[PDB]
Design a protein around this ligand. Sequence first.
Ligand SMILES: N/C(=C\C(=O)O)C(=O)O
Ligand code: SF4
Length: 298
Amino acid sequence: DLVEEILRLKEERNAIILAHNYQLPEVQDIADFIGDSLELARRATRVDADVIVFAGVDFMAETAKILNPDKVVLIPSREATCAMANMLKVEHILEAKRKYPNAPVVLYVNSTAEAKAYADVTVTSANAVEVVKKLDSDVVIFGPDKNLAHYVAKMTGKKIIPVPSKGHCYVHQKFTLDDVERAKKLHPNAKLMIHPECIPEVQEKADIIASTGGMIKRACEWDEWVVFTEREMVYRLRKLYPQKKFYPAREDAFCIGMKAITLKNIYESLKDMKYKVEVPEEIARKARKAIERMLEMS
Ligand SMILES: N/C(=C\C(=O)O)C(=O)O
Ligand code: SF4
């Protein structure tokens, strides 16, 4: 009975479980808070727990550690990684920063703490449009996702410099126009939730374009949705709105890094206090300054 033992160990450790929307259904059923990365980290800043067990990928647990340095942030598996965030290196930021020294370095939250030390302001897939448009410069260095960069470039009108060149998410890259055509034929009455990390030609056929947190907010606008993101988001939406109907655009659209977290290693995470996520004091200083600047900009 892992559920019973995890709940006991969670109490004995004075811990709180934070799970991303892409986590397995069994993981979400035992989580205290569920949402996207920045929300989960921002919800922990008002909470007294000694330990944070972050059911998510590496950069998410890092962000929680930067915003909660007084807590022990545990990751159940060091293999829970984001393939897109690891594509962006500091050699890529310093390169574009040499040719555009007046362009601010805007980095997606899906990035390493080391990369955030060179960023002037972080952004999520929910506030990227307003933050970039509120910036003083017309040139913006944006990464690592080039598909989100295209969406921000199309909404703000400012020329976006994507960094790196081929930075993208392989999960949301799976969605093609044939998946859009297949959805409209299987569910003709359903609207289309499409994540901004999808390719632009898929974005332009969406009913709404929003992050997983935005999909939850704007789900009330219709009773039937086809979800173009990680498949485990469908379970999250079904638990929140049981009266509505949700369908995955692709069942094979799954994140290996997210699936590295199971109910077993969460139990072992609380038992052995592993694996601790630490961020250099140096790096957490500048990375937090970019996050707090994002929060001051909504
Ligand atoms: N972009 C989000 C998750 C991810 O990229 O893994 C989100 O929840 O908005
Ligand atoms: S889905 Fe794409 S972006 Fe979100 S975590 Fe898995 S890999 Fe990184």
